[PDB]
Amino acid sequence: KPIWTRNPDDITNEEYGEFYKSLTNDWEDHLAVKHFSVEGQLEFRALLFVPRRAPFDLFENRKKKNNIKLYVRRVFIMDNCEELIPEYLNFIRGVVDSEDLPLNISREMLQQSKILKVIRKNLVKKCLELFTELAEDKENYKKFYEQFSKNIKLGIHEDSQNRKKLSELLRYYTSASGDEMVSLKDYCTRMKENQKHIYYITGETKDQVANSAFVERLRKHGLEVIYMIEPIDEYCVQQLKEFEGKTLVSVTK
């Protein structure tokens, strides 16, 4: 039986790795795996993997198609179905096996398919669920975030429906964090009693921004400033107007 039709409880991580490596020709095994099924009026199984390295630089390679393999009742259909998952998750590798799709479905009907849209929404929900489970382990989440932080920020820009969950996955240096990147929830725990806004500064290097005088000003009060040191962060805070009810404020206003 194909591994994706087996019960996840009975599959070792070495069996997943072996399958992951034959599927992707990676020389390393997966960083993470999410194996699940939906049943009832919609019926399908999915076996998704996060690679240990970003497959390409996302921002210089926009609109790359995902490589998930689509099956119908265990018969391979295609492996470049754009609408199976949104672009910011196009690094996800693996297999989706649908029971209800037409076996003879063309790509143009696939594009219009209501079954494909409900499958896609389930993939996103389970990927985000995987990322949050991965955030429980601080050491391996650092590995994921180094490779895919740009994808999370691209999602914040492009996917308002999940913008809340995605924002919980962000990590940043701050004027109070030293060598560690922290979450917005962590920032919120340290806010002063009177503080009603989340302060950030955008810039180019950690050092130039840590030396900046707008930061020094708030350092003189008991106030923490978030370091946003990549160009997507501009787009990112535009749509991330606030968090936990706290408005985001640039220290340069």
Residue numbers in the entry: 294 to 546
Authors' text:
Hsp90 belongs to the chaperone superfamily and plays crucial roles in maintaining the stability and the activity of numerous client proteins, including kinases, transcription factors, and steroid hormone receptors. Hsp90 contains three well-defined structural domains: an N-terminal ATP binding domain (NTD) for ATP-binding and hydrolysis, a middle domain (MD) for client protein recognition, and a C-terminal domain (CTD) mediating Hsp90's dimerization. Client protein recognition via protein-protein interaction is the major function of Hsp90α’s middle domain (Meyer et al., 2003, Prodromou and Pearl, 2003).
In this manuscript, non-covalent allosteric modulators (SOMCL-16-171 and SOMCL-16-175) targeting Hsp90α’s middle domain (Hsp90M) were developed for the first time. Compared with the binding of SOMCL-16-175 to wild-type Hsp90M, its interactions with Hsp90M F349A and Hsp90M D350A mutants are almost fully abolished, and its interactions with Hsp90M L382A and Hsp90M K443E mutants induce less significant CSPs of the corresponding residues. The mutagenesis study data suggest that the α-helix spanning I522-E535 might not be involved in the direct binding of SOMCL-16-175 and the compound binding cavity in Hsp90M is composed of F349-N360, D372-G387, and K443-E451. According to the backbone resonance assignments data, the region spanning F349-K356 of Hsp90M undergoes slow conformational exchange in solution and the resonances of the residues in this region are fully absent from the recorded NMR spectra. The slow conformational exchange in this gate-like fragment is expected to favor the recognition of the active compounds by Hsp90α’s middle domain. Meanwhile, as revealed by the CSP analysis data, the binding of SOMCL-16-175 would induce long-range allosteric modulation effect on the hydrophobic region spanning K362-D372 of Hsp90α’s middle domain.
